[PDB]
CSV table of C-alpha atoms and ligand atoms in Angstrom, one decimal:
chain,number,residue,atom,x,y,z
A,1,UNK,CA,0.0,0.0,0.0
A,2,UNK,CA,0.9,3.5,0.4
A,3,UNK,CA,3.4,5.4,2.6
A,4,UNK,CA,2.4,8.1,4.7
A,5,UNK,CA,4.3,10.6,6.4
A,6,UNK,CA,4.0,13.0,8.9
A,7,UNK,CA,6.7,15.8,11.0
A,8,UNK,CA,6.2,18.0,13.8
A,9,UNK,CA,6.6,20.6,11.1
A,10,UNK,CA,5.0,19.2,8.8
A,11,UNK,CA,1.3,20.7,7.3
A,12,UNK,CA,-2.2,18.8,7.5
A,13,UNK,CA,-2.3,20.7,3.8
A,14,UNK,CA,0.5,18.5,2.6
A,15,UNK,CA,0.0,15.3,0.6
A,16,UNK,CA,1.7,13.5,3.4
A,17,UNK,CA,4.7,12.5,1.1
A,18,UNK,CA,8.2,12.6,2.5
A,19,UNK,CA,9.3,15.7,1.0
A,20,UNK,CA,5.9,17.6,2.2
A,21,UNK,CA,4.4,15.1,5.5
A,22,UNK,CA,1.2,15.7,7.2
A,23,UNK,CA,1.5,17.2,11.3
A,24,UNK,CA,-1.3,15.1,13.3
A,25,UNK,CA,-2.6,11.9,13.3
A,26,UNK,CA,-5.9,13.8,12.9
A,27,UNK,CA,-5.4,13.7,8.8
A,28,UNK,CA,-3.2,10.3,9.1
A,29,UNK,CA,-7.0,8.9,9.8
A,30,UNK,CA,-8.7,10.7,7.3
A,31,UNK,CA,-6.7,8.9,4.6
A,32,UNK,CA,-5.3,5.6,5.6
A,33,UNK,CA,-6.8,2.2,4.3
A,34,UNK,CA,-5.6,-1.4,4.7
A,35,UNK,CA,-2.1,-2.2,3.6
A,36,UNK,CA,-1.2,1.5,4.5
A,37,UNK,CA,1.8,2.5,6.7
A,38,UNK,CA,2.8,6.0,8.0
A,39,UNK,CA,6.0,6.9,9.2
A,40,UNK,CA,6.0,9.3,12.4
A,41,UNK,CA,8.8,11.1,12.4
A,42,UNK,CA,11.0,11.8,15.7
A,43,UNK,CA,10.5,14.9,17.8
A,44,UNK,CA,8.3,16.3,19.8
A,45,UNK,CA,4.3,16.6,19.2
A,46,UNK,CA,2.4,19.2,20.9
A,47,UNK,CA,-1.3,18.1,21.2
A,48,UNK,CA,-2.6,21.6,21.0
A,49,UNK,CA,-4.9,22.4,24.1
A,50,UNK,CA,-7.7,23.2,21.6
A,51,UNK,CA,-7.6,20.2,19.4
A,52,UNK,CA,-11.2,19.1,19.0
A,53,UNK,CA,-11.3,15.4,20.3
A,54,UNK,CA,-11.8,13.2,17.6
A,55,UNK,CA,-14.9,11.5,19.4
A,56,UNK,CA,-16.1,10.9,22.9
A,57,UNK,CA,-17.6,8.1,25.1
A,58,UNK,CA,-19.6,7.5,27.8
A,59,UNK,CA,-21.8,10.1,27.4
A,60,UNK,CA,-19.4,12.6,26.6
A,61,UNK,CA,-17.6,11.7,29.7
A,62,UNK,CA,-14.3,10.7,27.7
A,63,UNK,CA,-12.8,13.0,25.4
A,64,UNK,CA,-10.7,10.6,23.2
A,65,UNK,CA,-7.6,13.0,21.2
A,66,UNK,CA,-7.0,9.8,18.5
A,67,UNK,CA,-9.7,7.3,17.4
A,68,UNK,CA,-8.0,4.4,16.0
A,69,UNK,CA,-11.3,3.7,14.4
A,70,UNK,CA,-10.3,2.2,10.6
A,71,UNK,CA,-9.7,-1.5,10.5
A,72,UNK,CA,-6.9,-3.1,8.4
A,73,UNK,CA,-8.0,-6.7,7.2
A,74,UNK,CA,-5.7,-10.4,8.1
A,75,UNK,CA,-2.0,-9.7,6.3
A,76,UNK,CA,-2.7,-6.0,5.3
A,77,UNK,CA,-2.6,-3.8,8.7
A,78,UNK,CA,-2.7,-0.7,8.8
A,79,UNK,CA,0.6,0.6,10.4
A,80,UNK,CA,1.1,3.4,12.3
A,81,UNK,CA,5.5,3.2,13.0
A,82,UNK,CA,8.3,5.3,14.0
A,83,UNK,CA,10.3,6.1,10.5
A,84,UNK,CA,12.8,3.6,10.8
A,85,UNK,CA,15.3,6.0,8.7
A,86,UNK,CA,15.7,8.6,10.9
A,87,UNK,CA,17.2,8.0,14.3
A,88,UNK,CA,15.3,9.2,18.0
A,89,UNK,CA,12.1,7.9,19.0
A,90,UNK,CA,8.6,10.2,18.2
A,91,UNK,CA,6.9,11.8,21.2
A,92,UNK,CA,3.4,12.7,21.8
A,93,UNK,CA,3.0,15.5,24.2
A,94,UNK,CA,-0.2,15.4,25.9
A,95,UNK,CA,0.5,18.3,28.5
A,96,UNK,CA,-1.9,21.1,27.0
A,97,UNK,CA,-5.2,19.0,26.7
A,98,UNK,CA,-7.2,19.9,29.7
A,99,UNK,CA,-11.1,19.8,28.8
A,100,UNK,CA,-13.2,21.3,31.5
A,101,UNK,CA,-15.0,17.7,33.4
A,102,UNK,CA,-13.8,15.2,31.2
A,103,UNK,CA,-11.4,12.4,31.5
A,104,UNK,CA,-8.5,12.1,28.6
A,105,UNK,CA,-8.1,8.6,25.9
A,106,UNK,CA,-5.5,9.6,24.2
A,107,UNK,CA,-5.6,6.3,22.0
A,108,UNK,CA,-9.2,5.1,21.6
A,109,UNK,CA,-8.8,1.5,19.3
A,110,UNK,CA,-12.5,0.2,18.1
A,111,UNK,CA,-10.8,-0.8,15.1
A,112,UNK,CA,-9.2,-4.0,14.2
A,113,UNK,CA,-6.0,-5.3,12.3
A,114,UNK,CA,-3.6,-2.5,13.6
A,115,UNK,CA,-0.3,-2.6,14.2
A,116,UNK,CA,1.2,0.4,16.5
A,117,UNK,CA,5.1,0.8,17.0
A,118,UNK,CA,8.4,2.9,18.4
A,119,UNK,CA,6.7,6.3,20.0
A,120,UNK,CA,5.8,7.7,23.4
A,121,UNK,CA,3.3,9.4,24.8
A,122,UNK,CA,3.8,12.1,27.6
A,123,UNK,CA,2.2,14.4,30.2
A,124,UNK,CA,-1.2,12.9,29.6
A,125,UNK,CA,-3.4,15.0,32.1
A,126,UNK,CA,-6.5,14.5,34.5
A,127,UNK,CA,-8.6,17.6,35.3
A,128,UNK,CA,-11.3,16.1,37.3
A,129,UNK,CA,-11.0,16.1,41.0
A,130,UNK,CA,-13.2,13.6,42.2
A,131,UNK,CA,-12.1,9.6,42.1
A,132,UNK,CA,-11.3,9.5,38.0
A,133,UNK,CA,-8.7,8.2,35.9
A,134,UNK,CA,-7.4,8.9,32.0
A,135,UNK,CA,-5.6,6.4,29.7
A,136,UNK,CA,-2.8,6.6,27.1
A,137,UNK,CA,-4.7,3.8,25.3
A,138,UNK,CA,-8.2,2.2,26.0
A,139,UNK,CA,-9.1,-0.9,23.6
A,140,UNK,CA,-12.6,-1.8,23.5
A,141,UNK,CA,-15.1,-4.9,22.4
A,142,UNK,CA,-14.5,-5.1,18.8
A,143,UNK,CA,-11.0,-4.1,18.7
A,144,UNK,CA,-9.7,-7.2,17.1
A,145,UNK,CA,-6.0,-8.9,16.3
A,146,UNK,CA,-3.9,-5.6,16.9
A,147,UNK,CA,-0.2,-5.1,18.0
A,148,UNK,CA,0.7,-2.3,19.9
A,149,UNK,CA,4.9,-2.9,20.1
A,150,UNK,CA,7.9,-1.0,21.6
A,151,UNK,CA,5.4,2.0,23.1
A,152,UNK,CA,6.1,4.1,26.0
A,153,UNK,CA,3.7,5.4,28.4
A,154,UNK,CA,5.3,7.8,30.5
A,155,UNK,CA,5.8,11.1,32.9
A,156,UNK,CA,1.7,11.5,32.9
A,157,UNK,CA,-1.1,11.2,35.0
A,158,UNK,CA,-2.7,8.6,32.9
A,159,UNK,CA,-3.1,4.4,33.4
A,160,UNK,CA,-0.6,3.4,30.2
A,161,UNK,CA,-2.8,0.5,28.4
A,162,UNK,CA,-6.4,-0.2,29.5
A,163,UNK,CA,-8.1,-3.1,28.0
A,164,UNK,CA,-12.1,-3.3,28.5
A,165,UNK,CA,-12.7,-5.6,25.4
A,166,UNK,CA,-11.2,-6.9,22.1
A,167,UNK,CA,-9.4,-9.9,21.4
A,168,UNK,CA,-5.9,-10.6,20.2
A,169,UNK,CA,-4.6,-7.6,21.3
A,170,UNK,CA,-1.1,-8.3,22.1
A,171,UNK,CA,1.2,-5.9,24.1
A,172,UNK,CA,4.8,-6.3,23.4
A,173,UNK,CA,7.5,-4.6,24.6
A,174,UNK,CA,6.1,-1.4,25.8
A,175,UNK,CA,7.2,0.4,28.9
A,176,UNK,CA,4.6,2.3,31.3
A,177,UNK,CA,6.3,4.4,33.6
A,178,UNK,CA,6.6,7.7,36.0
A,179,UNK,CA,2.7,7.5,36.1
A,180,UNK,CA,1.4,9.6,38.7
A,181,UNK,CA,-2.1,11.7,39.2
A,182,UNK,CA,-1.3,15.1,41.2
A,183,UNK,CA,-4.7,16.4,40.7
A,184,UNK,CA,-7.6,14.2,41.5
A,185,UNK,CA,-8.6,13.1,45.3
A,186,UNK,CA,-5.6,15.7,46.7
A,187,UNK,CA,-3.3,14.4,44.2
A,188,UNK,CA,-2.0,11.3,46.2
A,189,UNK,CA,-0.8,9.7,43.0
A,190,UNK,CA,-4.3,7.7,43.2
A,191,UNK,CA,-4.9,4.9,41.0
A,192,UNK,CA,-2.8,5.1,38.1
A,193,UNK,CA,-1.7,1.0,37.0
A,194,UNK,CA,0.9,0.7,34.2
A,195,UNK,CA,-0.9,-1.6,32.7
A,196,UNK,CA,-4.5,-2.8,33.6
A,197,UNK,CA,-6.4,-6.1,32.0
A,198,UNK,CA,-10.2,-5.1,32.3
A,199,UNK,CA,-12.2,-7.5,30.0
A,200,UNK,CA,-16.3,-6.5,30.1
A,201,UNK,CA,-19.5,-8.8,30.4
A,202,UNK,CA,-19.8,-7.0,27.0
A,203,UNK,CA,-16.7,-8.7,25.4
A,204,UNK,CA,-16.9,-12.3,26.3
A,205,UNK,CA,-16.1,-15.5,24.0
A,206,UNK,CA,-14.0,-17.1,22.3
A,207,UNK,CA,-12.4,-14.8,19.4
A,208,UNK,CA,-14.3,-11.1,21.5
A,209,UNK,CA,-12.5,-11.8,25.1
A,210,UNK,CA,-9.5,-14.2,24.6
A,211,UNK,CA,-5.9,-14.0,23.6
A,212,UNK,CA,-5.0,-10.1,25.1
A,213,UNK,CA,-1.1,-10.7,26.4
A,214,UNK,CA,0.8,-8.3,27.5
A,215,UNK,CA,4.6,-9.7,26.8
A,216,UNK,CA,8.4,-8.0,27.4
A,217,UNK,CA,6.8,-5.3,29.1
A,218,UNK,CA,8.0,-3.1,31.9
A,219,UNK,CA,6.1,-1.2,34.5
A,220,UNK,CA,8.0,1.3,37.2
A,221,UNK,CA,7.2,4.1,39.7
A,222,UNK,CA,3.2,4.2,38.6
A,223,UNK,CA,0.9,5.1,42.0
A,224,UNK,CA,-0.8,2.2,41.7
A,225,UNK,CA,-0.1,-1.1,40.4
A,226,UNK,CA,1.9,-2.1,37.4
A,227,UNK,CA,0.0,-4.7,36.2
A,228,UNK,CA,-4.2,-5.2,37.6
A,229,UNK,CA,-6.4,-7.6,35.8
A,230,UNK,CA,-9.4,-6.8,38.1
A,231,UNK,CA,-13.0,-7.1,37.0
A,232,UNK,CA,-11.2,-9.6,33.9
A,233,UNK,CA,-13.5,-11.6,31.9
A,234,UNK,CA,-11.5,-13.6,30.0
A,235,UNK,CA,-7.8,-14.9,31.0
A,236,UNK,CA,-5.0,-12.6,30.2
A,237,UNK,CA,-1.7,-13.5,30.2
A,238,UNK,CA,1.3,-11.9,31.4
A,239,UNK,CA,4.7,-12.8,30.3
A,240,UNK,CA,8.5,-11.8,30.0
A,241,UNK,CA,7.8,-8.6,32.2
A,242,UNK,CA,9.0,-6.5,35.1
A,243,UNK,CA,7.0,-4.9,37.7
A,244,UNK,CA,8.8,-2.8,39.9
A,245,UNK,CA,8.7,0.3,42.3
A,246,UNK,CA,5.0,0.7,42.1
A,247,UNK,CA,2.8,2.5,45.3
A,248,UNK,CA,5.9,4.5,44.8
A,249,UNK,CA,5.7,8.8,43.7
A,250,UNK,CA,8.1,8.2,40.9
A,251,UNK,CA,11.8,8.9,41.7
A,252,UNK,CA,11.0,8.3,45.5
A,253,UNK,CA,10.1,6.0,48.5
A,254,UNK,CA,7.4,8.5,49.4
A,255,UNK,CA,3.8,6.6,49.8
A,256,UNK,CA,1.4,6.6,47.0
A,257,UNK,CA,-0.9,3.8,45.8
A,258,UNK,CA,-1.7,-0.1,46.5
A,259,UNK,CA,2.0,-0.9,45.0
A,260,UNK,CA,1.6,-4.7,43.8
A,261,UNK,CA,3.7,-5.6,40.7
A,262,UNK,CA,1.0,-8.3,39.6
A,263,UNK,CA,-2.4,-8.2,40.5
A,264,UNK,CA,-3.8,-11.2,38.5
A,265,UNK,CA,-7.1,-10.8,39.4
A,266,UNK,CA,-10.7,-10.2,41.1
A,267,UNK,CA,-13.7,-8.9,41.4
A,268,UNK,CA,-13.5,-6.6,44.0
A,269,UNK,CA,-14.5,-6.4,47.9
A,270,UNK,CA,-17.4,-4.5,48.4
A,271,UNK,CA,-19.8,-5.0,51.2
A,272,UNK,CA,-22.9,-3.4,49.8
A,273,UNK,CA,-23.6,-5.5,46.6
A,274,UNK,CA,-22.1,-8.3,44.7
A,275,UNK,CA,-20.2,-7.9,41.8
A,276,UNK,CA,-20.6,-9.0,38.2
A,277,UNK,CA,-18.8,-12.0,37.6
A,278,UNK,CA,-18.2,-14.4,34.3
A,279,UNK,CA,-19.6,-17.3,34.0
A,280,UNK,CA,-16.6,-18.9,33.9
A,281,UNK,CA,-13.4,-17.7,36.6
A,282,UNK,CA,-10.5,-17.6,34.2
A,283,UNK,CA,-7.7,-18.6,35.1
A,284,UNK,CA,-5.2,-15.9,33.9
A,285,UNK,CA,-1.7,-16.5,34.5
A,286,UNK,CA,1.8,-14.3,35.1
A,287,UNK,CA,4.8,-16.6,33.5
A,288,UNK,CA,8.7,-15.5,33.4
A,289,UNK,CA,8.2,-12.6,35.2
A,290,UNK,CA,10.2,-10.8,37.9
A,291,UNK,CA,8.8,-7.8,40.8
A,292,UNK,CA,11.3,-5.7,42.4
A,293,UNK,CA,10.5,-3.5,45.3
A,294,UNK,CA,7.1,-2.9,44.7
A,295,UNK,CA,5.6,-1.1,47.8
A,296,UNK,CA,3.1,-3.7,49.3
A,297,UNK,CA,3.3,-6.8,46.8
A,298,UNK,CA,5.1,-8.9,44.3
A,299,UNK,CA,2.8,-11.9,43.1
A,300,UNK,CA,-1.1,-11.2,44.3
A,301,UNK,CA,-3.8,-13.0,43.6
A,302,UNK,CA,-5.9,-9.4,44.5
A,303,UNK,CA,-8.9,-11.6,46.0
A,304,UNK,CA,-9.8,-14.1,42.6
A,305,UNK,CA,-12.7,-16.3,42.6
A,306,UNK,CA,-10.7,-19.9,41.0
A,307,UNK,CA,-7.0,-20.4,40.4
A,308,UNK,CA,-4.5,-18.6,38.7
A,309,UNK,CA,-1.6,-19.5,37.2
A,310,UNK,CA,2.2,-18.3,38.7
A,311,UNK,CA,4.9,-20.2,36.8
A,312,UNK,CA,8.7,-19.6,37.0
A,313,UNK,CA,8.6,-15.9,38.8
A,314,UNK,CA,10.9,-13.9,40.5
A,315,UNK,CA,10.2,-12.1,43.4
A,316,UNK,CA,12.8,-9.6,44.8
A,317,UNK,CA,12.3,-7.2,48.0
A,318,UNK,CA,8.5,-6.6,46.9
A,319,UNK,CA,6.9,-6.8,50.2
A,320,UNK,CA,4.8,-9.7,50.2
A,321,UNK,CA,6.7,-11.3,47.3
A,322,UNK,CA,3.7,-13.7,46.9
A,323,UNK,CA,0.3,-13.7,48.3
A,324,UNK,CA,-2.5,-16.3,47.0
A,325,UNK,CA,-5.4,-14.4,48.8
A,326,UNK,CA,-8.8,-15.5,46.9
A,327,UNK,CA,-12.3,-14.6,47.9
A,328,UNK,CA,-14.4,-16.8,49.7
A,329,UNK,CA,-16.6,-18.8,47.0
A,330,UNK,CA,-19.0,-19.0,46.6
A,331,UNK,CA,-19.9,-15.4,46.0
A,332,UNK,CA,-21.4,-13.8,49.4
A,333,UNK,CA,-22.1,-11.2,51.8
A,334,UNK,CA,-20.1,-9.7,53.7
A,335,UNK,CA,-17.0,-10.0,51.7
A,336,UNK,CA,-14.5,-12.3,53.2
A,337,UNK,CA,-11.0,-13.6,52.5
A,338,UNK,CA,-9.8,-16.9,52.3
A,339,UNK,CA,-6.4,-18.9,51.5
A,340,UNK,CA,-5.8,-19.3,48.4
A,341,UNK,CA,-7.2,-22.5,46.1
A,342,UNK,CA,-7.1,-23.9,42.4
A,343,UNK,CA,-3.7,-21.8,41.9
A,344,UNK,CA,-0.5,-23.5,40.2
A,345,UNK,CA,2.3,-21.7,42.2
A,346,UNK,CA,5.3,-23.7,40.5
A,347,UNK,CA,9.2,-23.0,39.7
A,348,UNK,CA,9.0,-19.6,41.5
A,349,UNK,CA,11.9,-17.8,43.1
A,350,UNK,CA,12.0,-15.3,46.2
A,351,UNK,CA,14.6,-13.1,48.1
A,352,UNK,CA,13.8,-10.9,51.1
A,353,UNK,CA,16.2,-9.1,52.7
A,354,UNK,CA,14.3,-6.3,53.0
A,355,UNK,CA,12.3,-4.5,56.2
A,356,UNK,CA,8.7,-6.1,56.0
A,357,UNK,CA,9.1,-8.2,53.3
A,358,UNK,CA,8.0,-12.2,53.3
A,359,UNK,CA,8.2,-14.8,50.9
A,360,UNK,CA,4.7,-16.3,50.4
A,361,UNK,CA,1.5,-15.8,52.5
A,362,UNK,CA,-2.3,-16.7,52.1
A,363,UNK,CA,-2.1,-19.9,50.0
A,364,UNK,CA,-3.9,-23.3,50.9
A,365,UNK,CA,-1.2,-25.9,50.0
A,366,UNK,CA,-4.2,-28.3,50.6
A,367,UNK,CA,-6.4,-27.1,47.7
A,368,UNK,CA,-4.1,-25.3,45.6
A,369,UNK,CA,-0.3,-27.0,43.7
A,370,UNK,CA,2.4,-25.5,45.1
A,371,UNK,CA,5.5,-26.8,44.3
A,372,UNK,CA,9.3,-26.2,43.3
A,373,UNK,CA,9.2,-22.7,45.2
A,374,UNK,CA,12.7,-21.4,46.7
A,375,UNK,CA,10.4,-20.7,49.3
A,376,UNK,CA,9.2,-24.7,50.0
A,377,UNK,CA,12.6,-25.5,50.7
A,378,UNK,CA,15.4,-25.9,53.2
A,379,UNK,CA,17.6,-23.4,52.1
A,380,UNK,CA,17.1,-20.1,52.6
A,381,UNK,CA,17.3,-17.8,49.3
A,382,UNK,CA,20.7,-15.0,49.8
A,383,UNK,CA,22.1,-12.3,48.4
A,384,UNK,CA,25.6,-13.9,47.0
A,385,UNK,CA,23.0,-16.4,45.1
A,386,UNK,CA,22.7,-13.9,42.4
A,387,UNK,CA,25.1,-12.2,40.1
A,388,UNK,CA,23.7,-8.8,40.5
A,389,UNK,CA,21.1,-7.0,42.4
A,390,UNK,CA,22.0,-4.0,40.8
A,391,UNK,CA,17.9,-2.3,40.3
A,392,UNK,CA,20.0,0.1,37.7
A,393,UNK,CA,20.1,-2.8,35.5
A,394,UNK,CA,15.9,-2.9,35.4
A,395,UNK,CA,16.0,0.9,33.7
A,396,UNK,CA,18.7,-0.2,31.1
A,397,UNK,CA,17.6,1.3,27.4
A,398,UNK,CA,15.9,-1.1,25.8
A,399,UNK,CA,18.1,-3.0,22.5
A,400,UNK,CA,17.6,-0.9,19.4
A,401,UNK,CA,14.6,-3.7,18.0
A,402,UNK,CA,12.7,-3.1,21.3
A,403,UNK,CA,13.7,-6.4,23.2
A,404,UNK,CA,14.4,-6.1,27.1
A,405,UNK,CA,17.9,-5.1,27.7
A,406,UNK,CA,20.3,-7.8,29.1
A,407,UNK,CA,20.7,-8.2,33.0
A,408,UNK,CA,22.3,-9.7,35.3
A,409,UNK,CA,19.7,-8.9,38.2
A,410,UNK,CA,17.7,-12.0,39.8
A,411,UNK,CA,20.2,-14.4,37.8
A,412,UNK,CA,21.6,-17.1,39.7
A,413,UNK,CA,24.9,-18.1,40.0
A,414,UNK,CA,25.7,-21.3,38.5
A,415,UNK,CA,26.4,-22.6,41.7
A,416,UNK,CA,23.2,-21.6,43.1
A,417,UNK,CA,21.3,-23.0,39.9
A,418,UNK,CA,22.4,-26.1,41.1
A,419,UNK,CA,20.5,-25.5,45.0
A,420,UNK,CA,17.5,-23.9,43.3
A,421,UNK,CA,16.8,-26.2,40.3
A,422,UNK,CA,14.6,-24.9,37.7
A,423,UNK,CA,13.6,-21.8,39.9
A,424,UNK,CA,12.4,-17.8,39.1
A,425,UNK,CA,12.7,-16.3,35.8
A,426,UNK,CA,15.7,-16.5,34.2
B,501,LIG,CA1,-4.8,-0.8,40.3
């Protein structure tokens, strides 16, 4: 198909060539088709503060700046990229969009068959006082088979990926980071999660619900939680990533939010009413994955209903490195907590050395399978049983294709290997 370009100085009058590129992704929507690409290229992007959003939701709650809201079709996406000639990464500055009472979508995706890469978007703002949130991307029932790869999320006061729907959505690489609301409730950081798995009543079944993963990913220093799958129709899976220093204002130890690294599920608490829940409890897993120093948790089950699955982790200094805690079941009144059943807690590995911080708690080794934990056995997991510890490591630039850098933190020592067979993430 066609190649589209577009420049911070570019012109929305221009034909979008190379030599003469459009300026916003406002025009980029009004002409793409399937099989197109555009190349963004790198500098900054100034949403200006009187950019009419390109639609709204919830009753004109949301004011959403992009709709993603053309479809590409199997094997001809429509591609929205980073110019891979020219060196630096594009940035979307989000700072100047303040609409009187409404929350911010900066990336509204109804549409299905996109492929989103290599760009970052910044100083997303919330207005609204009250209990709120805003999202750098919110992905709906519908949105269908799209790729969202090498993103960053960052330095805003908006949750970085928020699914509510779609299926085969898969979120690779992408980093969500410095997230931190300084306006709403007093400004207490709030509830701002990296990354947050949300799938609706709306969106359930096979091929409407299933097959979201977010993979490679890193969340750090958002008020909240890195990773929430809450109120989760459908399993999501979380793979390959790193979840540390959430609960955290960014830069500091000073207290925000809930600070768990993983929270792999739920349906919430409440004593009033009971919630909606799916038919079926999914059983959503986190695989490969390490937590550092997350405020209150590493590894939580966040009060499921069923089992989840937690598969060769690593948990390092993150408070309660793993806790199993489900809801009593069957769904009741008032709300209580019980030790954790169904779960597969296998091949994980955990360190504390850390004030207040404890291997494994809530779990019911009775009803759920826990085995080949550091923390079931004799030996007591230490410091000189890794080759670094170094949390510097965890920040490293990502390679030039996107990957996770190389690290040496929470990698045993070929020695140790040997004591902790088949153990943690690496
Ligand atoms: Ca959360």
């Amino acid at each position: 198909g066609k190649t589209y370009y577009m420049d911070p100085e570019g012109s929305d009058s221009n034909p979008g060539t190379s030599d003469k590129p459009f300026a916003t992704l406002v025009k980029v929507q009004e002409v793409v088709v399937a099989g197109d690409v555009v190349y963004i290229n790198p500098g900054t992007y100034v949403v200006p503060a009187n950019q009419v959003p390109m639609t709204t939701t919830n009753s004109g709650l949301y004011h959403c700046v992009f709709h993603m809201n053309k479809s590409g079709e199997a094997g001809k996406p429509i591609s929205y990229l980073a110019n891979p000639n020219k060196q630096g990464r594009p940035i979307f500055d989000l700072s100047q969009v303040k609409p009187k009472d409404q929350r911010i979508t900066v990336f509204y995706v109804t549409g299905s068959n996109l492929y989103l890469k290599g760009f970052d978007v910044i100083g997303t703002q919330v207005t609204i006082t009250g209990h709120t949130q805003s999202e750098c991307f919110r992905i709906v029932k519908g949105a269908n088979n799209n790729k969202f790869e090498d993103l960053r999320t960052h330095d805003g006061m908006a949750i970085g990926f928020y699914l509510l729907g779609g299926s085969n959505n898969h979120i690779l690489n992408c980093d969500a980071y410095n997230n931190y609301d300084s306006v709403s409730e007093g400004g207490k950081g709030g509830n701002v999660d990296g990354f947050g798995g949300h799938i609706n009543s709306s969106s359930v079944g096979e091929g409407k619900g299933t097959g979201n993963v977010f993979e490679g990913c890193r969340a750090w220093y958002n008020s909240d939680d890195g990773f929430d799958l809450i109120n989760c129709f459908e399993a999501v899976k979380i793979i390959n990533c790193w979840s540390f220093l959430n609960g955290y204002k960014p830069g500091t130890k000073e207290v925000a939010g809930d600070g768990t690294g993983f929270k792999a599920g739920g349906y919430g608490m409440a004593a009033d009413k009971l919630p909606a829940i799916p038919s079926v409890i999914p059983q959503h897993e986190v695989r490969n994955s390490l937590a550092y120093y997350n405020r209150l948790r590493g590894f939580y089950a966040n009060h499921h209903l069923g089992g989840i699955i937690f598969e060769s982790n690593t948990a390092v200094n993150s408070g309660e490195n793993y806790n199993m805690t489900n809801r009593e079941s069957p769904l009741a009144l008032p709300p209580t907590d019980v030790n954790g059943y169904d779960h597969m807690v296998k091949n994980n590995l955990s360190l504390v050395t850390r004030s207040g911080s404890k291997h494994i708690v809530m779990v019911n080794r009775a009803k759920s399978e826990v085995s080949n934990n550091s923390f079931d056995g004799s030996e007591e997991v230490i410091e000189t049983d890794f080759i670094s510890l170094e949390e510097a490591e965890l920040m490293r630039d990502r390679k030039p294709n996107g990957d996770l850098p190389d690290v040496n933190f929470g990698k045993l020592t070929t020695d140790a290997e040997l004591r902790f067979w088949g153990m943690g993430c690496f």
